[PDB]
Design a protein around this ligand. Sequence first.
Ligand SMILES: [Zn+2]
Lengths: 73, 36
Amino acid sequence: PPVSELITKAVAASKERSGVSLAALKKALAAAGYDVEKNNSRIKLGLKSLVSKGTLVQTKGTGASGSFKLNKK
Amino acid sequence: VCEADAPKVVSRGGCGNTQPVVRKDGMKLWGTWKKS
Ligand SMILES: [Zn+2]
């Protein structure tokens, strides 16, 4: 399954008012059996694609270093 | 908006899409979507 679903599912499972950090996303995908080490660069890209698709709102920071929430709009 | 949750998470079945500002100009119904 593509990493955009795994990320969206992790952000939905940890839904809050702040927003899953990249470190929490790493932890959730690793707990989901996804190798976050080798494919970290893929994650940053896929995450960026999800922000560029507007599917994730950046709530703090800039780019992948930030916190993110599912764009309910 | 069509809120999907009635004001635990309980879903009323809604969607979450924003609503347009309808206006009338002759016989043509315009609807203004104010995105964000
Ligand atoms: Zn609706």
